[PDB]
């Protein structure tokens, strides 16, 4: 009989995992403050890692990698890429980005303006996007004056990165989109990519001469369902799954989702996770960690894949909760606490 605790009631994902665990009749849930547990579905912020692995005779497992925030934070991810030799400043699959602290608080203000003045002089597309981790607050603008003045009005660290002016546009619709990939890393640091992704599409025609109306530029599921007027026209809930998207790439571009996009996605997932492996691995630690990641990608009209951000506490698509959550119990939980296919994951081998 295995014991687990729940310390994040807002996790749609692990709320289902907790539902599945109890359904096996072999897992018992305890109060959220009981230290005698096998598995912790920990909280998002300030998870007390230091208290794990000190209970005599209890192998303990937690669903978050201590230190993985370096990858799932806007400003941290930029710093990691620019300073990690494995990724280099010349990383080809990540948009040119800069960390910009507000003037009321290192900082890369002057470095951004130099590259900005170079684009402005060379007639090149000089459209950038500003964002932060404390948003629902995003601004897309072509003038550096507006971008910097928008951050000073705030008080949190922001990141300025190049805006992909040439995104791949689905048809009909002439509309933007992004791709969400779910990746599970287990206690052995095996990287498993869920075979099912989702394209969160924009139901509005992408307009390149008006960044003021952010309805056709931001493909977030909450924005399209609140500020867009064509929600659910082309695909239910602005969610196209790999089966449809793959068939589209064949009829239109005469290629497959695997060859044109998925190879790059798998390469990016590996590069990011292999990079921080020495810093977060729990291989020789007194407790074990696993974690579910949500990678967001962009695709340009050249079929080049760009990494947007990594989410450390991602939600799932309603249609894939069952398959994925079960997969979390199979490879991430029961692998350490066995019970009395054709995997739904794609293992990305690598050298540890």
């Amino acid at each position: 009989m295995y014991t687990f605790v729940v310390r994040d009631e807002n996790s749609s994902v692990y709320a289902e995992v907790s539902r599945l665990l109890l359904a096996t009749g072999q897992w018992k849930r305890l109060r959220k403050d009981n230290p005698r547990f096998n598995l912790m579905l920990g909280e998002r912020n300030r998870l007390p890692f230091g208290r794990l692995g000190h209970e005599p005779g209890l192998v303990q497992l937690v669903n978050y990698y201590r230190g993985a925030d370096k990858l799932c934070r806007k400003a941290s991810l930029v710093k990691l890429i620019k300073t990690s030799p494995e990724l280099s400043e010349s990383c080809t699959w990540f948009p040119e980005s800069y960390v910009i602290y507000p003037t009321n608080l290192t900082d890369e203000r002057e470095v951004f303006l130099a590259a900005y003045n170079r684009r402005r002089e060379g007639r090149e597309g000089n459209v950038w996007i500003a964002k932060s981790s404390a948003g629902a607050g995003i601004l897309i603008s072509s003038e550096a004056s507006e971008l910097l003045d928008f951050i000073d009005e705030q008080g949190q660290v922001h990141v300025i990165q190049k805006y992909l002016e040439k995104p791949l546009l689905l048809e009909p619709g002439h509309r933007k989109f992004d791709i969400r990939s779910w990746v599970l890393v287990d206690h052995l640091y095996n990287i498993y990519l869920y075979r099912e992704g989702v394209l969160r599409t924009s139901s509005e025609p992408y307009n390149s001469a008006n960044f003021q109306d952010k309805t056709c530029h931001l493909t977030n599921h909450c924005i399209q369902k609140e500020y867009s007027k064509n929600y659910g026209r082309y695909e239910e809930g602005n969610e196209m799954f790999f089966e449809e998207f793959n068939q589209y790439l064949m009829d239109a571009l005469n290629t497959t989702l695997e060859n044109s996009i998925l190879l790059q996605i798998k390469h990016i997932i590996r590069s990011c996770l292999m990079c921080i492996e020495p810093a977060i691995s729990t291989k020789h630690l007194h407790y074990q960690s696993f974690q579910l990641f949500g990678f967001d990608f962009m695709v340009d009209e050249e079929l080049k894949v760009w990494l947007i951000e990594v989410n450390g506490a991602p939600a799932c698509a309603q249609k894939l909760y069952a398959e994925l959550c079960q997969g979390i119990v199979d490879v991430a939980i029961s692998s350490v606490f066995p019970l009395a296919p054709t995997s739904i994951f794609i293992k990305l081998h690598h050298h540890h």
């Binding site: 007390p48 890692f49 230091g50 208290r51 692995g53 000190h54 005599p56 201590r66 230190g67 020495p278 810093a279 020789h284 630690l285 007194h286």
Partner: protein, 438 residues
Amino acid sequence: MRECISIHVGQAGVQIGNACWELYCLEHGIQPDGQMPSDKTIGGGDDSFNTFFSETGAGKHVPRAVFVDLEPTVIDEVRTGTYRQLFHPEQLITGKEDAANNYARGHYTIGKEIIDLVLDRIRKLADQCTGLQGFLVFHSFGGGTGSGFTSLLMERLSVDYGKKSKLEFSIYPAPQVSTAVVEPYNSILTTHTTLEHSDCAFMVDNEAIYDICRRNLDIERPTYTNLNRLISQIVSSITASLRFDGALNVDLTEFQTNLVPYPRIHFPLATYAPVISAEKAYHEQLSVAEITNACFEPANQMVKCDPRHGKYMACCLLYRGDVVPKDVNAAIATIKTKRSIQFVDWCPTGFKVGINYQPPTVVPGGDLAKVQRAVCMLSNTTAIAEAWARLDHKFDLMYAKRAFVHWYVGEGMEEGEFSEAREDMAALEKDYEEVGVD
């Protein structure tokens, strides 16, 4: 030459001290009768080993040590043990009934009645010193004597020897080798009243020593003898610089200078390697790089925690055996390119290195195998704050219900000393966070 006086308080301090002086004797060639054939200056001498051993006219080499326990069963082992001839009666102090795992009983009730006697015996050893450096105080956190009486002794030592350094070797409580439930109380009470009196403290978590014994020595259920022999190896590596010719950590003041830029943050993390099982057929002798790399593996730390998620304030590498500086720097370079070693911006990113050519001595019949080289790393990481958090949390669980508090109030302690001590720890945990996180 400047003398050092060792003080062992409670069962943990006495039994650990007994293991150390056993090791010290084997290291300096001292026999159980106190004789030292290699000491050509009979009945005198200011050699490095004389910092820990005085000498009689008859050639006996007597430890500069005092053993204190409020109950006599642990110290009676020394009076009739293998090295009984080393000590004389004045050095062994025992009461008639212990502190019952009750800090207040050790500090107040029983401490008040025996403190003057202990200081008197210490004064006698101090009178033999021509330039006393300070004291090394061994004790447990969880015991009523180890915690309660130690804090009182450290207060008086600061009064009777103002300009003298004091270092601790403190045993952090582990449930796997403890039958006491109130140890979180005692640990936090004794840390609170000892903080301003200790210049540098080496915490050893029994949980870590326990697992090293099971993992590396293949002891299914380790005993105190197994734990103490391993613990005395680490202690020996740390005090070796005071007992042998050298230039790094030559006196007690240099421990603070090299490991503690911030006074309250004076708990360095100790890591030791290699620990090889003697029962093994025959192990492949490890290189300088492999044993150095082992110092950044959590499994060989005296306190289990993750230095990858803290900041370093200092770092010493103490090598013993066949080690030349060329190999050390080569390994250091290899580790900086692989490990996450974050230093505080107001401290240099450096490593003070000491090499003693004499390899680690092992007690015949002990569990440790003879190795050609070994290292002990002393690093001041904010990661060791994890141990304070664990302890403070257990303190909060019981104190919220006032569980067991009446036992302490009944010995004359005020309840307010509980919260006063807990708030001092909450300030200590905050200091670590201010120094380590962004």
